[PDB]
Amino acid sequence: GSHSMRYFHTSVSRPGRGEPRFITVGYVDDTLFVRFDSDAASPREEPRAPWIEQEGPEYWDRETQICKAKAQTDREDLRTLLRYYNQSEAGSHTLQNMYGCDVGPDGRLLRGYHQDAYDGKDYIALNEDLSSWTAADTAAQITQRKWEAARVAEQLRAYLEGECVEWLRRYLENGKETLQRADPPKTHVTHHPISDHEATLRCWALGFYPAEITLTWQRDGEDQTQDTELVETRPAGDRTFQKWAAVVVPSGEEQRYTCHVQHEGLPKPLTLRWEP
Amino acid sequence: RRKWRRWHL
Amino acid sequence: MIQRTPKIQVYSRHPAENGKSNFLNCYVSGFHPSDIEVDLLKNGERIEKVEHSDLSFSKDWSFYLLYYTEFTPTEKDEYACRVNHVTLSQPKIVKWDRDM
The missing domain is CATH 2.60.40.10 (Immunoglobulins)
Incomplete structure (x- = not known):
């Protein structure tokens, strides 16, 4: 009946041991279908389900670019969070992000999601209206004002109502022998x-x-x-x-x-x- | 397919 | 900075039949931070060819990982999973009970 697409992201800093480790995976329902690991040999986003392998090389180029850019953004954001929380540069910290969409049996958007967490606790989340934010503390309120100024919610809403739903339906059709079984x-x-x-x-x-x-x-x-x-x-x-x-x-x-x-x-x- | 993240914390 | 201790399950992919090939699984879930050390043991010795899933996490942000290897169960051989995490004072060892 109902289906979901989710992208999960984790960056973990490791002071004294190079740049943060970045790992992201994508799921449709309970099926893992893509993976990217910054610590792998020549990092590229790789397929993990047969139905996604039929996408052409321009799909994998764009996906890989987006992953590399997210890893870069996370490196900067981890430095910023040290300042927001008055933390030392010596410890390891964790930045997590999930976003995605649920669609109903009729193939229309049921709910969209986008949320970030720092060291295992909620940081900032897009509300169900896809127009407002829930900030967890006074640091996240700084981010909230930046994102309200830059109309981030409007950018996410366009993706969640449009591309997220359209590409999920595409995957469900191409993977119907497993995803719909x-x-x-x-x-x-x-x-x-x-x-x-x-x-x-x-x-x-x-x-x-x-x-x-x-x-x-x-x-x-x-x-x-x-x-x-x-x-x-x-x-x-x-x-x-x-x-x-x-x-x-x-x-x-x-x-x-x-x-x-x-x-x-x-x-x-x-x-x-x-x-x- | 993924969304470009174009904003900082 | 929250810390969560891993939950651990050790089990086979299929119901165990002595002498038939199978997969031994160690599933660790509910932990934070993500650094964790997991060994699969046979009679107390570390198995060498062990694969693991890619790091993912649940709705409460806690991580989970699947470690596994092919094995052939016998009535004599003893298998286990050893887990170390910053939340554990000493490594935790969980033995494979085929009834669970």
């Missing part, structure tokens, strides 16, 4: 005795895409959300994801427990039970 979870339940009295039931979901999933345990149709241990959804390494949910159960009572799986790749939700 939901892979359903392969599911099973395993049984792990703790003692003579109790056992862990673990409900597994493997090999699904996209990462969004809901796993819950029920006993006689009552949600055991209080007693369920969930792991964070984790990448399998092959584009797909994994997750499990576990409950501790009185031995001999396993058949009272059902695991419920919801994912966009499934016709209808699944219910599983432990099978001896």
Whole structure:
């Protein structure tokens, strides 16, 4: 249904060890599709998904120029942030930026984003109106006045409403065999005795895409959300994801427990039970 | 595709 | 200057079958700053050919990384992930339990 395009950027200064490290990656939904690393041999933006390789060399030239320019801007901005926060030149600091757009099933803009962070904390963010700013502190208010004077929000709005949406739709069409394919979870339940009295039931979901999933345990149709241990959804390494949910159960009572799986790749939700 | 960043902090 | 300690998961790409090729994964997430050292161990020795994903981050700005390598699980061999980060006094070692 709904889709997103995001570009992520990290610059990390390293005083005494050369210029800051700069790494940026682009995502459509949960799929990484481009990458640039300043520390790589002859840095260029590189493809990481098959559907983006069909773009011509002028695409990769422009992308690489933009990345190199961002790395340069970050070097200057990191020096400025030292002044804004009365910091010494000896420490390592981190500058992060994300921007992108969400589009709905009808292919129109749902929301645009552009936000920056310094040393892991919010610095300045474009508001949902794509016309105003939220500054985190008095330093970021200095940036906010500069950006209001230079009409930065109007420049971002043009991109987020226009190019961001148009190029996302292009990618979704060229990558439709993967980006518009939901892979359903392969599911099973395993049984792990703790003692003579109790056992862990673990409900597994493997090999699904996209990462969004809901796993819950029920006993006689009552949600055991209080007693369920969930792991964070984790990448399998092959584009797909994994997750499990576990409950501790009185031995001999396993058949009272059902695991419920919801994912966009499934016709209808699944219910599983432990099978001896 | 990416947006040119043309502003400083 | 916020600091966040990594969360760590060690797991295989596919359910483990002894003698069949697989991928061992060490997923580190939720940490800040981004400098981190991750080793995959086999019986306590560092595995040499380990690949890792490119640095990305979540909505709360915290980083995540995937380290992985091909392996063939046996009933005898013991695998683990060792993580050092500025937020940890000593490196943290997490053993691969195939049931998790």
